[PDB]
Design a protein around this ligand. Structure first.
Ligand code: CLA
Ligand code: CLA
Ligand code: CLA
Ligand code: CLA
Ligand code: CLA
Ligand code: CLA
Ligand code: CLA
Ligand code: CLA
Ligand code: CLA
Ligand SMILES: CC(/C=C/C=C(C)/C=C/[C@@]12O[C@]1(C)C[C@@H](O)CC2(C)C)=C\C=C\C=C(C)\C=C\C=C(C)\C=C\[C@@]12O[C@]1(C)C[C@@H](O)CC2(C)C
Lengths: 162, 211, 208, 41, 64
């Protein structure tokens, strides 16, 4: 009940929308036999809709004036209340993104220490790429240990015109 | 130095050098840098040293609790039962813990950067006794059993510490999928060894085969 | 100089006839590289051994079921043997996976590092636990000293490959005749000899 | 055989190995686990 | 004789060249008193497509 919003568990617009979708899906049930493939498909879609509304609700998710769930993003404001899960868990993307970056940077540096590193880019060295992909699980430790040693950057060896 | 974690085809690069509990296990090659290796061994020593005290504080009390000697709560609710007593302070334990712990943690920190950097003009009169022998291995702290000639006692220390770390991870995971204690989950494993198993007792892996 | 898989054809360059059960049949050029050949030979040997054990077990339980015992057929055997069992699924699955992880990991590292597990690591076993050939271990898996004679070991290796290939070719046939007749393999064999002219693969509705 | 396995390292290793793996992983995750709008905390 | 050793990697110091602050291998050094005798060769091509150029003696520095 922050930023003027209300929990999805006590909102009339949320229930109104839920019944609307359950009704528009149920209107298509009369056009088919009670035991065929379109009937089974429509029944599976109805079960998924009921489960999603139940899953979206009772999990601290709150909506505002229209039944649509809103998301709290300020840390602290999302930590003082049970709203950390909605967007404060940015560390999942940061982990996968840093994993991709560390694997690519390790492949660029290692491949450059070879005669003509070009054809190694158009024709990947798959045993070296697979070995470097499964070796970068602890990428933040390698990043902090490669920064203190100064092996992450260059001093002044850049094609500049400044 | 000690037996390899695998029987073959796994030759490390920076693990050839002598070290305490050297088993040659480093697949991600994290300790390639010498300074980072020297810092990671201290981190492993501190983590194992505190995990040992934590696992004995949980397991040793759980033995008497399951037998019936004491009426103390389990570890997952020992915190929820200490503060409801009438004579127990508020949540100031975290602050006094942070202050009194940071005071000695910074001494141990400045000792790693500059080994034996405890000058005479720092403490009152024990300003000379804090000169540790090696990094992570001091002398004036411990009083007996340490003036021997052969160091592989540290191997027992490191092996007990690694087993303790793995044990605490099992304590936090077993009590997260079953809601019981370690010996409470161990005693039931002795009764039915095929029924209470992580593959089928707790919701660990999605096994849905109920034909 | 040796009988080939296609009389009149020519065998490849990387198949001289020194391999166990060599016949020169490799049209898709697989196992041309030395490492790929080293991996493919072990894959064939492990497949031959598992196929021989599985076919022998299927024929044993099928013959016992035809004789009168309480044995289920080869197909749907796991369904009716799990409903009345105290061993729970999932636990049994991971128990099998846990034991097979240890065995197959030691066998894999024996292939990448030939003669490496026999170094006193696993409970102090030095003489055994070290293979003699590519996919032919020794020391512990040879109770009878039948491998200490090359003149008989070569012929016995040839017999193992030629029997395993027929066994896996038979296992593929077990699935086909089951899916085509919904009967036991020993029931299909006894029904074929009862009427070799009328019943066959062409008079069963399916596969026409 | 060496030429075929080296041919398989140009454009398929990046446009059909990773693409098929990543697409199949995200699709199977969204298939067994239905539609995820929060960390379910 | 006046230029650097033939075959030694050098660094370019011409502030308006495509290989500024780069490392190039010296292929030959002329001994006729010309303005730009040190001829170098670089692994990476320029915007035009060439990979070699000749610099003077003052705009050539040793690598790092
Ligand atoms: C050496 C430590 C150790 C020991 C003795 C045990 C023992 C036990 N565990 Mg546990 N566990 C451990 C570590 C350990 N665990 C760790 C580190 C984790 C986090 C991944 C877990 C997570 C876990 C869960 C989720 C569950 C158990 C459960 C159980 C009980 C049934 C066995 C089972 O289901 O498979 C065990 C599952 C594992 C993941 C352990 C296998 C791999 C470990 C880490 C290898 C270590 C073994 C060691 C090398 C050899 C044994 C040493 C011992 C003789 C001292 C059993 C008494 C189940 C239970 O409570 O039954 C109701 C259960 O649900 N464990
Ligand atoms: C239009 C201009 C242009 C073009 C044509 C290219 C083209 C290329 N760039 Mg480039 N680039 C450009 C502009 C351009 N760039 C610009 C403006 C910049 C900024 C200055 C860069 C900076 C840049 C960098 C930093 C890099 C490239 C790289 C590459 C190469 C990528 C090869 C690849 O597919 O990646 C790889 C794609 C992948 C998906 C690799 C993942 C492989 C997985 C892990 C293998 C696993 C698959 C598995 C075995 C299959 C099993 C599946 C099974 C389950 C079915 C490629 C030839 C990269 C390179 O050098 O290649 C290595 C490189 O790192 N570029
Ligand atoms: C630039 C990004 C950003 C922005 C715009 C805000 C904005 C805000 N934060 Mg905040 N915060 C941020 C990043 C940010 N934060 C980060 C990175 C952290 C660490 C994870 C925090 C941790 C944090 C905490 C612990 C708290 C806030 C709080 C607040 C709110 C009141 C601020 C205040 O001083 O009280 C009033 C100022 C009067 C002059 C405010 C809307 C407070 C809050 O949530 O309100 C209940 C709160 O206590 N934040
Ligand atoms: C793994 C290689 C790699 C790495 C480590 C980086 C890293 C970086 N890039 Mg970059 N980039 C790459 C590839 C890479 N790039 C490629 C291939 C392109 C051409 C499409 C670009 C085009 C690009 C632009 C236009 C810009 C950057 C910028 C940046 C910086 C800002 C962070 C960012 O994420 O921007 C965004 C990065 C992208 C949008 C590229 C995403 C495409 C994927 C991730 C690249 C595929 C890499 C491949 C799989 C690696 C092969 C693995 C190997 C095992 C075979 C950062 C240092 C920004 C900058 O200038 O610095 C501040 C910027 O403006 N990049
Ligand atoms: C924070 C705990 C911790 C730390 C800091 C270390 C640190 C170290 N260990 Mg170690 N170890 C640990 C826990 C830890 N270990 C546990 C619990 C076990 C029992 C399974 C072992 C078993 C073990 C063996 C058998 C060996 C080591 C070795 C080493 C050293 C090799 C270098 C290295 O790997 O870098 C440091 C590693 C880390 C900092 C790990 C980072 C944490 C990751 C990112 C999270 C992992 C999550 C996990 C999978 C769950 C190193 C100093 C080798 C050695 O002794 O060298 C002589 C050696 O052979 N360890
Ligand atoms: C990682 C180290 C660690 C930590 C953080 C704790 C933390 C805690 N212990 Mg514990 N303990 C430890 C190690 C540790 N212990 C060890 C190594 C032993 C010896 C095996 C014990 C034996 C022990 C006993 C016997 C008791 C605690 C109790 C407690 C709780 C209240 C402490 C108190 O008020 O004093 C003591 C309070 C008394 C009433 C006495 C607290 C959560 C008390 C508790 O609440 O039971 C769970 C309790 O009585 N501990
Ligand atoms: C391993 C050898 C082998 C043997 C001994 C048999 C034997 C038999 N099969 Mg069978 N089959 C086999 C392989 C084999 N099959 C394979 C690989 C397939 C998959 C294509 C099939 C698919 C199959 C079907 C669908 C059916 C049978 C049926 C039968 C029975 C009647 C004969 C018939 O009409 O089959 C048909 C003959 C063939 C399909 C030709 C297969 C020839 C393969 C390549 C083996 C040849 C190797 C070797 C020369 C023969 C063995 C030597 C010696 C032991 C005789 C009979 C007892 C029928 C049955 O169930 O009886 C009621 C039935 O309908 N089989
Ligand atoms: C059906 C015919 C066909 C098609 C549609 C393509 C299409 C493509 N080729 Mg290929 N090629 C073909 C035939 C074909 N080729 C043949 C016969 C050969 C000779 C064997 C080659 C040899 C060849 C080489 C050597 C290369 C290509 C490359 C490329 C890609 C252009 C580069 C780019 O996207 O920017 C670059 C993209 C980035 C820098 C960012 C990296 C992230 C990317 C987007 C992830 C990779 C996913 C992939 C491109 C998308 C799916 C691919 C699709 C085929 C399913 C492109 C998608 C280049 C390539 O590998 O792509 C990198 C390249 O190096 N081709
Ligand atoms: C490479 C990413 C990826 C991943 C991680 C998975 C994972 C999975 N797939 Mg799958 N699949 C993928 C890509 C992927 N798929 C692609 C690209 C296709 C199109 C060719 C398919 C088409 C496909 C089908 C048709 C089926 C699966 C099924 C499955 C599940 C059971 C298989 C299994 O037990 O293996 C190991 C499990 C490891 C966790 C499993 C969780 C099966 C399923 O639906 O499960 C019931 C199923 O029938 N997949
Ligand atoms: C046939 C087979 C492989 C065939 C491969 C062929 C022809 C390949 C041919 C070629 O490659 C060459 C050579 C050269 C290439 O250039 C070209 C081609 C043309 C590609 C494998 C079978 C391999 C078959 C195996 C390994 C079977 C094992 C069976 C087991 C274990 C049984 C388990 C049971 O569970 C059941 C099923 C039922 C339960 O009731 C009972 C129990 C016993 C529990």
């Amino acid at each position: 009940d922050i930023a003027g919003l209300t929990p999805c568990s006590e909102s009339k617009a949320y229930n109104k929308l839920e019944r609307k979708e359950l009704k528009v899906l149920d209107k298509r049930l009369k056009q088919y036999e009670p035991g065929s493939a379109p009937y089974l498909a429509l029944q599976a879609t109805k079960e998924r809709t009921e489960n999603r509304f139940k899953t979206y609700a009772k999990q601290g998710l709150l909506c505002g004036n229209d039944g649509l769930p809103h998301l709290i993003s300020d840390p602290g404001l999302a930590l003082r209340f049970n709203h950390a899960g909605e967007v404060f868990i940015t560390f999942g993307f940061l982990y996968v993104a840093g994993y991709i970056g560390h694997v690519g940077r390790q492949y660029i540096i290692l491949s450059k220490e070879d005669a003509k590193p070009t054809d190694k880019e158009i024709i990947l060295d798959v045993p070296l790429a697979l070995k470097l992909a499964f070796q970068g699980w602890a990428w933040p430790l390698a990043s902090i240990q490669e920064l203190r040693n100064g092996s992450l950057l260059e001093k002044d060896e850049n094609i500049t015109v400044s | 130095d000690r037996p390899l974690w695998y029987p073959g085809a796994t030759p490390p690069a920076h693990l050839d050098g002598s070290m305490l509990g050297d088993y040659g296990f480093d697949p991600l090659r994290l300790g390639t840098n010498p300074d980072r290796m020297k810092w990671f061994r201290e981190a492993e020593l501190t983590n194992g040293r505190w995990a040992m005290a934590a696992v004995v504080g949980i397991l040793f009390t759980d033995v008497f609790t399951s037998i019936g000697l004491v009426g103390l709560p389990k570890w997952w609710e020992a915190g929820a039962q200490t503060y409801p007593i009438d004579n127990q302070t508020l949540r100031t334990l975290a602050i006094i813990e942070f202050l009194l712990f940071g005071w000695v943690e910074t001494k141990r920190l400045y000792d790693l950067r500059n080994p034996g950097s405890q000058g005479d003009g720092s403490f009152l009169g024990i300003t000379d006794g804090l000169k540790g022998t090696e990094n992570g291995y001091p002398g004036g702290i411990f009083d007996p059993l340490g003036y021997s000639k052969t160091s592989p006692e540290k191997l027992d220390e490191l092996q007990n510490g690694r087993l303790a770390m793995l044990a605490f991870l099992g304590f936090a995971s077993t009590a997260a999928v079953n809601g019981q204690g370690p010996i409470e989950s161990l005693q039931t494993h002795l009764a039915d060894p095929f029924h209470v198993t992580f593959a089928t007792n707790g919701v660990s892996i999605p096994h849905f085969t109920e034909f | 100089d040796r009988p080939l898989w296609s009389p009149g054809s020519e065998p490849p360059a990387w198949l001289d006839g020194s391999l166990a059960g060599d016949y020169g049949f490799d049209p898709l050029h697989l196992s041309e590289e030395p490492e790929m050949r080293k991996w493919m030979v072990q894959a064939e040997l492990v497949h031959c051994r598992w196929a021989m054990l599985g076919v022998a077990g299927i024929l044993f339980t099928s013959i016992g079921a035809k004789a009168g015992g309480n044995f289920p057929d080869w197909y749907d055997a796991g369904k009716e043997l799990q409903k009345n069992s105290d061993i729970p699924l999932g636990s049994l699955i991971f128990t099998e996976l846990l034991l097979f992880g240890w065995v197959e990991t030691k066998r894999l590292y024996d292939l990448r590092n030939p003669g490496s597990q026999g170094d006193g690591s696993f409970l102090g076993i030095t003489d055994g636990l070290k293979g003699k050939e590519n996919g032919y271990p020794g020391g512990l898996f040879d109770p009878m000293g039948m491998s200490k004679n090359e003149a008989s070991f070569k012929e016995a290796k040839q017999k193992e490959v030629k029997n395993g290939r027929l066994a896996m070719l038979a296992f593929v046939g077990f699935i086909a005749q089951h899916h085509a007749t919904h009967k036991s393999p020993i029931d299909n064999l006894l029904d074929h000899v009862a009427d070799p002219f009328h019943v066959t693969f062409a008079t069963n509705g399916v596969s026409i | 055989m060496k030429d075929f396995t080296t041919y398989l390292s140009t454009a398929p290793v990046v446009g059909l190995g990773w693409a098929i793996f990543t697409s199949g992983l995200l699709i199977e995750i969204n298939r067994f686990f239905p539609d995820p709008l929060v960390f379910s905390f | 004789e006046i230029g650097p050793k033939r075959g030694s990697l050098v660094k370019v110091l011409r502030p308006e060249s495509y290989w500024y602050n780069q490392v190039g291998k010296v292929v030959s050094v002329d001994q006729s008193g010309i303005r730009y005798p040190v001829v170098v060769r670089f692994e990476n091509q320029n915007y035009a497509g060439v990979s070699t150029n000749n610099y003077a003696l003052d705009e050539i520095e040793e690598v790092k």
